[PDB]
Write a protein that binds this ligand. Sequence first.
Ligand SMILES: O=C1C[C@@H](C(=O)Nc2cccc(C3CC3)c2)c2cccnc2N1
Ligand SMILES: O=C1C[C@@H](C(=O)Nc2cccc(C3CC3)c2)c2cccnc2N1
Lengths: 305, 301
Amino acid sequence: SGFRKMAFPSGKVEGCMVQVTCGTTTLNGLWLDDVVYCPRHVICTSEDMLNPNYEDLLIRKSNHNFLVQAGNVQLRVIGHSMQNCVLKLKVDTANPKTPKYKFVRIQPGQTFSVLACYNGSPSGVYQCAMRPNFTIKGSFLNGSCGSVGFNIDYDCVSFCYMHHMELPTGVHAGTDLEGNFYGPFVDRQTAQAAGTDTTITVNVLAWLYAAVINGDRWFLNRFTTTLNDFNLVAMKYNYEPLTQDHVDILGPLSAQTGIAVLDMCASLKELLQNGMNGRTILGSALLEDEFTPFDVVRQCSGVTF
Amino acid sequence: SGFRKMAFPSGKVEGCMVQVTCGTTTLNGLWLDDVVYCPRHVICTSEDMLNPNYEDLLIRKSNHNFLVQAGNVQLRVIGHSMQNCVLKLKVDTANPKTPKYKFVRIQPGQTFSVLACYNGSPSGVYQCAMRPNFTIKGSFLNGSCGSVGFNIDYDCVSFCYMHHMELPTGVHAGTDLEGNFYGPFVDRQTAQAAGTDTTITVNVLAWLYAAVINGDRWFLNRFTTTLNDFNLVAMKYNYEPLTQDHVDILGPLSAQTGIAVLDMCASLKELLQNGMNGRTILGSALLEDEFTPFDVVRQCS
Ligand SMILES: O=C1C[C@@H](C(=O)Nc2cccc(C3CC3)c2)c2cccnc2N1
Ligand SMILES: O=C1C[C@@H](C(=O)Nc2cccc(C3CC3)c2)c2cccnc2N1
């Protein structure tokens, strides 16, 4: 029993984290095979950050301007290039701890584990969702840039996120490992703001299924609904539309618990309209939207890595 | 900024997890140097579970009755002994991935990371606290026994928990790595039940200090309180007593934020009275009690 916000075990990623230094800037890099990946903003100083010309800053650098430290060992940089907003430093040694991996771009609503790091040293791991407004609600201080997010699908690490910056609201923005931002953000010091966020409906439903599986059933009711009626309610409460694909994805949980997705939608309708009436669900007084259907099934079935 | 329930990176522990089998029972063990630690109940059968006599079950076993698998490899067991409620299996290979480590017994309110494991392979990592009633609110299925809890302050892993069982209420009980249970529990399937659980007051206060550090002040008020009046009110909401030690421990957070500990106590009293009136603190609509003072300073500043 029990249901917790759970991250993937982080060991396979821990063996890839290094420190990257350029001038007076130190941040984290990801060392896979013979390349170190890190945010291209490592090459900027204070003045540069206001309006950087990255190609022009980069052409001025030699390999020896980038100091890469893996533990207590310096790696030799033998090449450098940029891909979108990530810098790729070719080094003279392949990482002997390189896991089986891929680079994947995730969709809003999908979850991943973040390994927060400082000076190339992993400090903490936590689970995040990519918000509908393409931010993440992370926990990051000065020095965390280049921290990465990932999933593990089998023995294969899927890297999906590299941390680039904090927005003024205190939420976080970054890129895939091919250097494309999630969201309408740019890597420069200027006023930027996230869009208004919405709640991830399919995930709330997943978590309601988790609650039922763990014995917490007070919110169930005799009623059902239709997709269109439910979506009018979702829109009113700043919930993402529920699609037929979402309904299909929750199919397993529906069959296991005997509660059809649109029956559970009728539960969720009532919760939005009436609140929780002083009760909790899985120890929370708000509706949790950072577990996917896959997360719920995985944790309520004991899958291993 | 931001504030998350954060676990330690699990890699140092992952490299120590093995599978232990005895008869038809398989669970997890922790392989450090040349010893594998696991719950002694691995040697029980169905019959045994109400009133096992562990010394009598153990004397009947040989080394070769214990199968230990580390990844794809069998380890050879060359010795065994029991210490309290843990079995220690001496094996013929020291674990080359053994981290710097120590065994520490923790007190209620302390937090740690759990690496949940099945068949000797890591499933997930999450953060837990030792509740005042000596249970933890974990996430554990059949096969999770022998999963461990730990902290990593610096490069040294401090092992503080090994998982043994789930109580009827769905909460979890286990031992330190010297095999002494937390709380009044025993490794038997007799009816046992945890004490009423209470809120960890010192941690709630820590987390209110975290909210102030992250720029949120809405819940403060102009009042203070004596320690004794605070405790008289807080007990009525099932909050643990706050002690002078706890007040001392909050001193650094007090000094960082400019808010005296007993003024923060006054804020908490009002929150218990009023609720949150549709607001949140660090993203929660309930008061959070699974961050320690030490955790707050580590994650914020
Ligand atoms: O998440 C973080 C990392 C880091 C940060 O946000 N840097 C940062 C901010 C704006 C723009 C840029 C770059 C693209 C041009 C980088 C930080 C420094 C100090 C305090 N908190 C944090 N939080
Ligand atoms: O945490 C867990 C592990 C495991 C469990 O609780 N085993 C267990 C229960 C009572 C007593 C004993 C031993 C000392 C005599 C062991 C379990 C089995 C089935 C369903 N859920 C779980 N949850």
